[PDB]
Coordinates of C-alpha atoms and ligand atoms in Angstrom, one line a residue:
Chain A
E1 CA 239.4 229.4 132.4
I2 CA 238.7 227.7 129.1
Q3 CA 237.9 228.8 125.5
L4 CA 236.0 226.8 123.0
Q5 CA 236.2 226.8 119.2
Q6 CA 233.4 225.1 117.3
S7 CA 233.7 223.8 113.7
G8 CA 232.2 225.7 110.8
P9 CA 228.8 225.7 109.2
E10 CA 227.7 222.6 107.4
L11 CA 225.2 221.9 104.6
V12 CA 224.2 218.2 104.5
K13 CA 221.8 216.1 102.6
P14 CA 218.8 214.5 104.5
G15 CA 219.6 211.1 105.8
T16 CA 223.3 211.6 106.3
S17 CA 225.4 212.0 109.4
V18 CA 227.5 214.8 110.6
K19 CA 230.2 215.2 113.3
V20 CA 230.7 218.7 114.8
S21 CA 233.6 219.5 117.0
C22 CA 234.4 221.7 119.9
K23 CA 238.1 222.4 120.4
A24 CA 239.2 223.4 123.9
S25 CA 242.2 225.2 125.3
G26 CA 243.2 226.2 128.8
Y27 CA 243.9 224.5 132.1
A28 CA 242.5 221.2 133.3
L29 CA 240.5 220.3 130.1
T30 CA 239.7 216.9 131.7
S31 CA 238.1 218.6 134.6
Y32 CA 235.3 220.2 132.7
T33 CA 232.0 218.6 131.8
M34 CA 231.0 219.1 128.2
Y35 CA 227.5 219.5 127.1
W36 CA 225.6 220.3 123.9
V37 CA 222.6 222.5 123.3
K38 CA 220.3 222.9 120.2
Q39 CA 218.6 226.1 119.3
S40 CA 216.3 226.1 116.2
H41 CA 216.0 229.5 114.6
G42 CA 213.8 231.7 116.8
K43 CA 213.3 228.9 119.3
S44 CA 214.4 228.2 122.9
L45 CA 217.5 226.4 124.1
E46 CA 217.3 222.6 124.2
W47 CA 219.7 220.3 126.1
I48 CA 221.1 217.4 124.0
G49 CA 223.3 215.7 126.6
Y50 CA 226.5 215.9 128.5
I51 CA 229.8 213.9 128.7
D52 CA 232.1 213.9 131.7
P53 CA 235.6 213.4 130.2
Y54 CA 237.0 212.2 133.5
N55 CA 235.1 209.0 133.8
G56 CA 233.6 209.0 130.2
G57 CA 230.0 209.0 131.5
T58 CA 227.3 210.5 129.4
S59 CA 223.7 211.5 129.7
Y60 CA 221.3 212.2 126.9
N61 CA 217.9 213.9 126.6
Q62 CA 215.5 211.2 125.7
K63 CA 214.6 213.1 122.5
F64 CA 218.2 212.7 121.2
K65 CA 218.8 209.1 122.4
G66 CA 218.8 207.6 119.0
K67 CA 220.2 210.7 117.3
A68 CA 223.3 212.1 119.1
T69 CA 226.5 210.6 120.3
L70 CA 229.0 212.6 122.4
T71 CA 232.7 211.8 122.6
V72 CA 235.9 213.5 123.8
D73 CA 239.4 213.2 122.3
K74 CA 241.6 213.4 125.4
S75 CA 244.7 213.7 123.3
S76 CA 243.5 216.6 121.1
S77 CA 241.2 218.3 123.7
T78 CA 238.3 218.1 121.3
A79 CA 234.7 217.2 122.1
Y80 CA 232.5 215.8 119.3
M81 CA 228.8 215.5 118.6
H82 CA 227.8 213.0 116.0
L83 CA 224.3 213.4 114.6
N84 CA 222.7 210.7 112.5
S85 CA 219.6 210.2 110.1
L86 CA 219.5 214.0 109.5
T87 CA 216.2 215.6 108.5
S88 CA 215.3 219.3 108.2
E89 CA 214.2 219.3 111.9
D90 CA 217.9 219.0 112.7
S91 CA 218.6 222.3 111.0
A92 CA 219.7 224.5 113.8
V93 CA 222.5 226.1 115.7
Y94 CA 224.4 223.7 118.0
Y95 CA 226.3 224.9 121.0
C96 CA 229.1 223.3 122.8
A97 CA 229.7 224.3 126.4
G98 CA 232.0 223.2 129.2
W99 CA 231.8 223.7 133.0
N100 CA 233.1 222.9 136.4
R101 CA 232.3 224.6 139.7
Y102 CA 234.8 227.5 139.0
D103 CA 234.1 228.3 135.4
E104 CA 231.9 227.8 132.4
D105 CA 232.4 228.7 128.7
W106 CA 230.4 228.4 125.5
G107 CA 231.4 227.9 122.0
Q108 CA 230.3 230.4 119.3
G109 CA 227.8 227.9 117.7
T110 CA 227.7 225.8 114.6
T111 CA 224.9 226.4 112.1
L112 CA 223.8 223.1 110.4
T113 CA 221.5 223.0 107.4
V114 CA 219.9 219.8 106.3
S115 CA 218.7 220.4 102.7
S116 CA 218.6 218.9 99.3
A117 CA 219.3 222.3 97.7
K118 CA 222.7 223.0 96.2
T119 CA 225.3 225.5 97.5
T120 CA 225.2 228.9 95.9
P121 CA 227.5 231.9 96.4
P122 CA 226.1 235.4 97.0
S123 CA 225.9 238.2 94.4
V124 CA 227.3 241.3 96.1
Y125 CA 226.1 244.6 94.7
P126 CA 227.2 248.0 96.2
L127 CA 224.6 250.6 97.1
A128 CA 225.7 254.2 96.7
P129 CA 223.4 257.2 97.2
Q130 CA 221.6 265.7 99.2
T131 CA 224.7 266.8 101.2
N132 CA 223.6 266.0 104.8
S133 CA 225.8 265.8 107.9
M134 CA 225.6 262.1 107.6
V135 CA 225.4 259.7 104.6
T136 CA 224.0 256.2 104.3
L137 CA 225.8 253.5 102.2
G138 CA 224.6 249.9 101.6
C139 CA 225.5 246.4 100.6
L140 CA 223.1 243.9 98.9
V141 CA 224.0 240.2 99.0
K142 CA 221.6 238.2 96.9
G143 CA 220.8 234.7 95.9
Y144 CA 223.0 232.6 98.2
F145 CA 222.5 229.3 99.9
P146 CA 223.0 228.3 102.6
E147 CA 223.2 230.6 105.6
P148 CA 225.2 231.9 107.2
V149 CA 226.8 234.9 105.5
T150 CA 229.0 237.5 107.3
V151 CA 229.1 241.2 106.3
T152 CA 231.7 243.7 107.7
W153 CA 232.6 247.2 106.7
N154 CA 236.2 248.2 106.2
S155 CA 237.4 244.8 107.5
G156 CA 235.6 245.5 110.8
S157 CA 236.9 249.1 111.3
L158 CA 233.3 250.5 110.9
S159 CA 231.0 249.0 113.4
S160 CA 229.2 251.9 115.0
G161 CA 226.7 252.8 112.2
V162 CA 226.0 249.4 110.8
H163 CA 222.6 247.8 110.3
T164 CA 222.7 244.3 109.0
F165 CA 219.3 242.8 108.3
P166 CA 218.2 239.2 108.8
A167 CA 218.3 237.3 105.6
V168 CA 215.1 236.3 103.9
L169 CA 214.5 233.2 101.9
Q170 CA 212.8 233.0 98.5
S171 CA 212.6 230.0 96.2
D172 CA 215.8 228.2 97.3
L173 CA 217.9 231.3 97.9
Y174 CA 218.6 233.9 100.7
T175 CA 218.9 237.6 100.4
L176 CA 220.0 240.2 102.9
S177 CA 221.4 243.7 103.0
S178 CA 223.4 245.8 105.3
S179 CA 223.8 249.6 105.6
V180 CA 226.3 251.9 107.0
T181 CA 225.5 255.5 108.0
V182 CA 228.7 257.6 108.0
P183 CA 229.6 261.3 108.3
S184 CA 229.7 263.1 104.9
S185 CA 233.2 264.4 105.7
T186 CA 234.5 260.9 105.8
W187 CA 233.0 259.5 102.6
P188 CA 234.1 259.7 99.7
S189 CA 237.2 261.1 101.4
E190 CA 237.9 257.8 103.0
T191 CA 237.2 254.6 101.2
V192 CA 234.5 252.4 102.7
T193 CA 234.3 248.8 101.4
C194 CA 231.8 246.0 102.2
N195 CA 233.3 242.6 103.1
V196 CA 231.1 239.6 102.5
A197 CA 232.0 236.1 103.6
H198 CA 230.2 232.9 102.6
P199 CA 231.7 230.0 104.5
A200 CA 229.6 227.3 102.7
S201 CA 230.9 228.3 99.2
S202 CA 234.4 229.3 100.6
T203 CA 234.2 232.7 99.0
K204 CA 235.0 236.2 100.4
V205 CA 234.1 239.3 98.4
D206 CA 235.2 242.9 98.9
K207 CA 233.2 245.7 97.3
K208 CA 234.3 249.3 97.6
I209 CA 231.4 251.8 97.6
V210 CA 231.8 254.3 94.8
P211 CA 229.6 257.3 93.9
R212 CA 227.7 256.9 90.6
Chain B
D1 CA 211.5 214.8 134.7
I2 CA 212.5 218.3 135.5
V3 CA 210.2 221.0 134.0
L4 CA 211.0 224.7 134.2
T5 CA 208.2 227.2 133.6
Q6 CA 209.3 230.7 133.0
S7 CA 207.2 233.9 133.2
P8 CA 206.4 236.2 131.6
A9 CA 207.1 235.0 128.0
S10 CA 208.0 238.6 127.1
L11 CA 208.5 241.8 129.1
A12 CA 208.3 245.4 128.0
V13 CA 210.3 247.5 130.4
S14 CA 211.3 251.2 130.6
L15 CA 215.0 252.1 131.0
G16 CA 216.1 252.8 134.6
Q17 CA 213.3 250.5 135.9
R18 CA 213.4 247.3 137.9
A19 CA 212.4 244.2 136.0
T20 CA 212.0 240.7 137.5
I21 CA 211.7 237.4 135.7
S22 CA 210.4 234.2 137.3
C23 CA 211.2 230.5 136.8
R24 CA 209.3 227.7 138.6
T25 CA 210.6 224.2 138.7
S26 CA 208.8 220.9 139.3
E27 CA 211.9 219.5 141.1
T28 CA 212.6 221.4 144.4
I29 CA 216.1 222.5 145.0
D30 CA 217.3 222.6 148.6
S31 CA 220.3 224.7 149.6
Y32 CA 222.2 221.5 149.6
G33 CA 220.7 220.2 146.4
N34 CA 221.2 217.7 143.7
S35 CA 220.4 220.5 141.3
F36 CA 221.6 224.0 140.5
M37 CA 219.6 227.0 139.2
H38 CA 221.3 229.5 137.0
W39 CA 220.3 232.4 134.7
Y40 CA 221.4 233.2 131.1
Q41 CA 221.2 236.2 128.9
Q42 CA 221.1 235.6 125.1
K43 CA 221.5 238.3 122.5
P44 CA 220.5 237.3 118.9
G45 CA 223.2 235.5 117.1
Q46 CA 225.3 235.0 120.2
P47 CA 225.9 232.3 122.8
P48 CA 224.0 232.5 126.1
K49 CA 226.0 234.3 128.7
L50 CA 226.0 233.2 132.4
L51 CA 224.7 235.9 134.7
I52 CA 225.0 237.1 138.3
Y53 CA 228.4 235.6 138.9
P54 CA 226.7 245.8 143.6
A55 CA 225.6 244.1 140.4
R56 CA 222.7 245.1 138.2
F57 CA 221.6 241.4 137.9
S58 CA 220.7 239.5 141.1
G59 CA 219.0 236.3 141.9
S60 CA 216.5 235.3 144.6
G61 CA 214.3 232.4 145.5
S62 CA 215.0 228.9 146.6
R63 CA 213.1 225.6 146.5
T64 CA 210.6 225.9 143.6
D65 CA 210.4 229.6 142.6
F66 CA 213.4 231.6 141.4
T67 CA 213.5 235.2 140.3
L68 CA 216.0 237.2 138.3
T69 CA 215.9 241.0 138.9
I70 CA 217.5 243.7 136.7
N71 CA 218.0 247.0 138.4
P72 CA 218.2 249.5 136.8
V73 CA 217.2 248.2 133.3
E74 CA 219.7 249.5 130.7
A75 CA 219.6 249.7 126.9
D76 CA 221.8 246.8 126.1
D77 CA 219.9 244.4 128.3
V78 CA 217.6 243.7 125.3
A79 CA 218.0 240.0 125.0
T80 CA 216.2 236.7 125.8
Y81 CA 216.7 235.4 129.3
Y82 CA 216.8 231.7 130.3
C83 CA 216.8 229.9 133.6
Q84 CA 218.7 226.6 133.6
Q85 CA 218.4 223.8 136.1
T86 CA 221.5 221.5 136.3
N87 CA 221.2 218.0 137.6
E88 CA 223.0 214.7 137.2
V89 CA 220.2 213.0 135.3
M90 CA 219.2 215.9 133.0
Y91 CA 219.8 219.6 132.3
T92 CA 216.9 221.7 131.2
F93 CA 216.2 225.3 130.2
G94 CA 213.1 227.4 130.7
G95 CA 211.2 228.7 127.6
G96 CA 212.9 232.1 127.7
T97 CA 211.7 235.6 128.5
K98 CA 212.1 238.2 125.7
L99 CA 213.0 241.6 127.2
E100 CA 211.7 244.6 125.2
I101 CA 212.7 248.2 126.0
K102 CA 210.1 251.0 126.1
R103 CA 211.3 254.3 124.6
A104 CA 209.8 257.5 123.0
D105 CA 208.5 257.4 119.5
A106 CA 211.0 257.9 116.7
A107 CA 210.8 258.6 113.0
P108 CA 212.7 256.5 110.4
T109 CA 215.8 257.8 108.7
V110 CA 214.8 256.7 105.1
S111 CA 217.2 256.2 102.3
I112 CA 216.6 254.8 98.8
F113 CA 219.1 253.4 96.3
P114 CA 218.8 252.5 92.6
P115 CA 219.9 249.2 91.0
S116 CA 223.7 249.1 90.7
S117 CA 225.5 249.0 87.3
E118 CA 226.7 245.5 88.3
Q119 CA 223.2 244.2 89.0
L120 CA 221.9 245.8 85.8
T121 CA 224.6 244.1 83.8
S122 CA 223.4 240.8 85.3
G123 CA 219.9 241.4 84.0
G124 CA 218.0 242.0 87.3
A125 CA 216.9 245.2 89.1
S126 CA 216.6 245.6 92.9
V127 CA 215.5 248.9 94.5
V128 CA 216.6 249.1 98.1
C129 CA 215.2 251.3 100.9
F130 CA 216.5 251.5 104.5
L131 CA 214.2 252.8 107.3
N132 CA 216.7 253.1 110.1
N133 CA 216.4 253.8 113.9
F134 CA 212.6 254.1 114.3
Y135 CA 210.3 253.2 117.2
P136 CA 207.9 251.4 117.7
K137 CA 208.7 248.2 115.7
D138 CA 205.4 248.0 113.9
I139 CA 205.7 250.1 110.7
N140 CA 204.0 249.8 107.3
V141 CA 205.8 250.7 104.1
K142 CA 204.4 251.1 100.6
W143 CA 206.0 252.3 97.5
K144 CA 204.9 253.5 94.1
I145 CA 206.6 253.4 90.7
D146 CA 205.8 256.6 88.9
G147 CA 202.8 257.0 91.2
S148 CA 201.6 253.4 90.7
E149 CA 201.6 251.2 93.8
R150 CA 203.4 247.9 93.6
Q151 CA 202.8 244.9 95.8
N152 CA 204.9 242.5 93.9
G153 CA 208.6 241.7 94.4
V154 CA 209.1 243.4 97.8
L155 CA 211.4 242.1 100.5
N156 CA 210.9 243.2 104.1
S157 CA 213.3 242.5 106.9
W158 CA 213.4 243.9 110.5
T159 CA 216.4 244.1 112.8
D160 CA 216.3 243.3 116.4
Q161 CA 215.9 246.1 118.9
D162 CA 219.2 248.1 118.9
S163 CA 221.4 247.6 121.9
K164 CA 222.3 251.3 122.2
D165 CA 219.3 253.5 121.2
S166 CA 216.5 250.9 121.6
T167 CA 215.3 251.6 118.1
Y168 CA 214.3 249.2 115.3
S169 CA 215.5 249.4 111.7
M170 CA 214.0 247.8 108.6
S171 CA 215.1 247.0 105.0
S172 CA 212.6 246.9 102.1
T173 CA 213.8 245.6 98.7
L174 CA 211.8 245.7 95.5
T175 CA 213.0 243.3 92.8
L176 CA 212.0 243.5 89.1
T177 CA 213.6 242.1 86.0
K178 CA 216.1 244.3 84.2
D179 CA 213.7 244.9 81.3
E180 CA 210.7 245.8 83.5
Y181 CA 212.8 248.3 85.4
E182 CA 213.7 250.3 82.3
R183 CA 210.1 251.1 81.4
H184 CA 209.5 253.5 84.3
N185 CA 211.4 256.4 85.8
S186 CA 209.9 257.5 89.2
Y187 CA 210.4 255.4 92.3
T188 CA 209.3 256.5 95.8
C189 CA 209.7 254.8 99.2
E190 CA 206.9 255.7 101.7
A191 CA 206.8 255.1 105.5
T192 CA 204.0 255.6 108.0
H193 CA 204.1 256.7 111.7
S194 CA 200.6 264.9 112.2
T195 CA 200.7 261.5 110.5
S196 CA 203.9 262.8 108.6
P197 CA 204.4 260.2 105.9
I198 CA 208.1 260.2 105.2
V199 CA 208.8 259.7 101.5
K200 CA 212.1 259.2 99.6
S201 CA 212.2 259.2 95.8
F202 CA 214.7 258.9 92.9
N203 CA 214.1 259.5 89.2
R204 CA 215.3 257.6 86.1
Ligands
LIG1 C1 230.2 227.3 136.6 O1 229.1 227.9 137.3 C2 228.4 227.1 138.2 C3 227.5 226.1 137.8 N1 226.9 226.1 136.5 C4 226.6 227.4 135.8 C5 225.3 227.1 135.0 N2 225.4 226.0 134.1 C6 225.8 224.7 134.9 C7 225.9 223.6 133.9 C8 227.1 224.9 135.6 C9 227.2 225.0 138.6 F1 226.4 224.1 138.2 C10 227.4 225.2 140.0 C11 228.2 226.2 140.5 C12 228.8 226.0 141.9 O2 228.6 225.0 142.6 C13 229.4 227.2 142.4 C14 229.8 227.3 143.8 O3 230.3 228.3 144.2 O4 229.5 226.3 144.6 C15 229.7 228.2 141.5 N3 229.4 228.2 140.2 C16 229.8 229.5 139.5 C17 229.5 230.8 140.2 C18 228.8 230.4 139.0 C19 228.7 227.2 139.6
LIG2 NA1 225.6 206.7 110.8
LIG3 NA1 239.1 229.6 138.6
LIG4 NA1 221.6 246.2 114.7

């Protein structure tokens, strides 16, 4: 089969251009046809175009004819999508996928934000709490731009009782929270920390939850 | 051009049940066909996943009308489903079908948290309330500061339907400046749906 790794999130000013990449590994990378798909937040999947690396042929959705250019780097097994004249309508998740008649794979997605607003890291505040069977802890990440942000608990060891809520936008900044419900025996007996990652500002923050 | 029309737009289905999604195309597909027809499942924040290829998901129909059947429906099938037609001149997707799970009513596990010492140092105050694992999605929440209802500086956010228990969760956040927060002492978080209003409170 084939695995696909897309480049990271990007914040760009309106009117500029961006090139996003899809790096491929596995057998017969020349044999797959690569295509790209746009999905605006809460919207449906939209085909941008494809490129066959074997003969170099390309086909574009008429709506992207002026906007998008697909290329493949045979030497480095990387597909590229160049977008130009960016406006806020280009803010979306962009997917890269590759297929042949045996196999298809998709990349994880690249979130692109076209905005005048400036990059801002999150403020991470711990939320600590009755002796029930189970206890709920929380993390508040506030005032960041742009999305996305990633929250994990105990570096990903705690996944079962997590609720991470969609961020919400106010003024020019995003806010979200995530909560963990854990057995009372485990906490405070075991340390539980909240791990927040903000790719755009290149910051990762770890906050241990501590009882007031 | 190839147009794909998917129906229904959304589907509410009980666990264990048989659910079928349709996709009609303007460009007929013969069995030897220029085009292909395929089905995708997308969970929020994830790539679409190719389906079908004794499975629970199965495809039928040829020519213009194509159906996806899920049998039996299970809890983690909550997702949006897309048909895709593949052709040398264009690829296109259907509009998507959102699959909702029907379950029994459930009451929210409420929790409320005071501003943290860190956030108070900063000079702001955020009171956070989690209403976890309730059904149905539609829930109204109000809160009062020492008995006085406040409609200002509240942040609501719903999760997607849970993949395991088919319940929704929600996060309400009340933000006041540091100095406005000091004035009062009693904060309560109130949920609706015996009416049984669930209330959580903290003092000072
Ligand atoms: C990679 O998946 C397939 C695709 N698809 C999957 C849906 N997206 C399109 C772009 C490629 C294809 F367009 C045709 C076939 C075929 O022609 C085929 C076959 O057996 O003839 C099998 N598959 C695999 C089983 C799904 C195919
Ligand atoms: Na350019
Ligand atoms: Na194979
Ligand atoms: Na969830």
